[PDB]
Symmetry: C3
Subunit: 266 residues, 3 copies
């Protein structure tokens, strides 16, 4: 894997946005061959989305032939709720770029058959072959997507129960009221994520330091599903200095020296 150790969250967002634009522009997407981009919600990717919007306004990237898949959606929360992941993606990203409505893919957490909706989603991914780049965050508890501790490391898309830790963290988007946070979510699996050609996980803040330690220094295990990135041929973690607090000094030095020429501009 690559670990990109940057100083501040603003730089993580600039690096991630530049990496997405690099992959899209080198791919040269068309209607017949779209670039397929997997996307997360949460607080971590906001700077990346804002950077991508500005790069599009400057004519540096077009999303006209970009197909997107999101990692997850809350179960039982109204789709037009401002904190649904559908609302998050339109308000923070889709409404500000030249993406096509038919190229947006989202999970519906309010159908009468969660298993059929998750299978529909997997089938739609397979209709494009592969996801070319999947961006994600990481939970305090190590999850990627909502693959909470003790998730199968070859799981597919399914309903999952959010941990109390996840719901406490996400309550900051519900006026700090954990009773407003949904208890379940539909989420792509660890196997679904590993099927992508490239995975880029953004990690910012001291709250994620134990998760980053598990990802980088820990072994492969189902309690910290971010550790599954060790199995993937093309995984990138982009992190800020507060997220490194639980790593060894030699670990940060190793990756800082490896990436020196790739971070000196950020």
């Amino acid at each position: 894997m690559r670990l990109i150790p940057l100083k501040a969250a603003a730089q993580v967002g600039k690096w991630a946005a530049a990496h997405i634009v690099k992959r899209i522009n080198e791919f040269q997407p068309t209607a017949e061959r779209p670039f397929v981009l997997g996307l997360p919600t949460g607080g971590t990717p906001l700077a990346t989305y804002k950077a991508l919007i500005e790069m599009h306004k400057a004519g540096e990237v077009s999303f006209k032939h970009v197909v997107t898949f999101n990692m997850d959606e809350y179960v039982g929360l109204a789709a037009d709720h401002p904190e649904s992941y559908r609302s998050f993606m339109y308000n923070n990203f889709f409404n500000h770029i030249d993406i096509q409505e038919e190229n947006i893919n989202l999970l519906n957490g309010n159908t009468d058959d969660h298993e059929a909706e998750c299978k529909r989603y997997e089938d739609k991914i397979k209709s494009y072959g592969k996801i070319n780049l999947f961006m994600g965050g990481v939970g305090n508890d190590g999850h990627i997507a909502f693959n909470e501790p003790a998730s199968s490391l070859s799981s597919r898309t399914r309903i999952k129960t959010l941990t109390e830790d996840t719901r406490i963290a996400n309550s900051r988007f519900f006026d700090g009221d954990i009773n407003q946070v949904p208890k379940y979510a539909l989420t792509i699996g660890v196997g679904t994520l590993l099927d992508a050609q490239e995975i880029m996980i953004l990690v910012t803040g001291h709250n994620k330091a134990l998760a980053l330690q598990a990802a980088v220094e820990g072994s492969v295990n189902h309690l910290w599903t971010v550790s599954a990135l060790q199995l993937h041929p093309k995984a990138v973690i982009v992190c800020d200095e507060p997220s490194t607090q639980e790593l060894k000094v030699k670990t940060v030095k190793y990756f800082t020296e490896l990436e020196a020429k790739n971070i000196v501009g950020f």
Copy 2:
């Protein structure tokens, strides 16, 4: 994975039996499409076998179109010895249900070519496509089937050398005389087990507490081959309270809350 934390071994057996009957009856097996069930010996599954026998007598399940494969057999022990795994399975299960003789599959530990017998067994599994549900136990030392510590995590069916720890445990079936316990066994591999559609491991007693800790809280490693369940898309561990002694309090609480609605009847 799912961890089902029950109080007592009797409940583990009732839960496991109910889960097997659920899978068989939803599958609707026929002569042309049998349900393929993998089975263990040892002390742990006895309550499950007794429960399945009673459910069959009550007309709740038929094994007429169930095909079975056992995990292992001792090498060098006479097949008609009362403690051969063949004898165990007929005396404790097959002689009491409507299973068909042609649908029973067992390893022969007394041929002149162990490798050919193991390959015959693998080829017979492949003749049915997949095992639909594989029930197992766990060794004190973490083994599934007889995949003793330092087994390949992608192993196939082969002869294995039993550890002293395993032979001491199993000597309770040989009047406590370790000199009567065979030294070798033919066993399906970790890879063979992971090829099943669903794996259900039963874990009872404080002797298994270190193995359960390795399965649930440890990382993937070849010393505790039960840890390979973390790689499987559909693994279930069913355990009693004595087996949880080495887990953290928060680990037991996590799974107890997740499964609350699924255990309240047991």
Copy 3:
């Protein structure tokens, strides 16, 4: 996996050479069906190469229909430098056996397109189907080939940056001058190695004791890529007593008892 615990490095070399000759002679290679052998450089395999040369001189093995692939080559070092891996292999092995020039495969570290050279190498392996036996060593830091800490466990052949630890170790071949040791190498990946039918890693000396502990007692992780052998169906580690210093007493006893009949002649 198999762990072969021998006393001294000389015995490790004799065992490894005997194992290679066993695989070649049982395979019965021909021009139309060659035996494909993966090979390492470094100090560890020298005794094995010398033993293989003597066995060939004695008529016990022929390399006429053996195809070889090496693990790696330094980037930027002249190919005719005496410490290039090309020079190592010809001077220590190829010039002393009846191998055919067209059957030798080596990475070229001095082309103008490292990615194309690595892909050429992968394509050449695939032209033979599989590598039948891949011999390797292990780095102080746990690497197999030059899959340095934090390498993908499904990596393919690519350029890698050598750690300071690796360069300090290898400086003994450059008059102790770390400034003469190349900084980069082309190396087969962890995935490339795991594609072989059988892997045999030689481990000698107390400098490798932490790496052997990670391989045998540790869990699967990308910091010690030798731990990936736990995933492979047919992995063998051959070690001497100094390399076992960080293992538990019970671990050495376990493998010594398992292999007793296979080591009593060495």
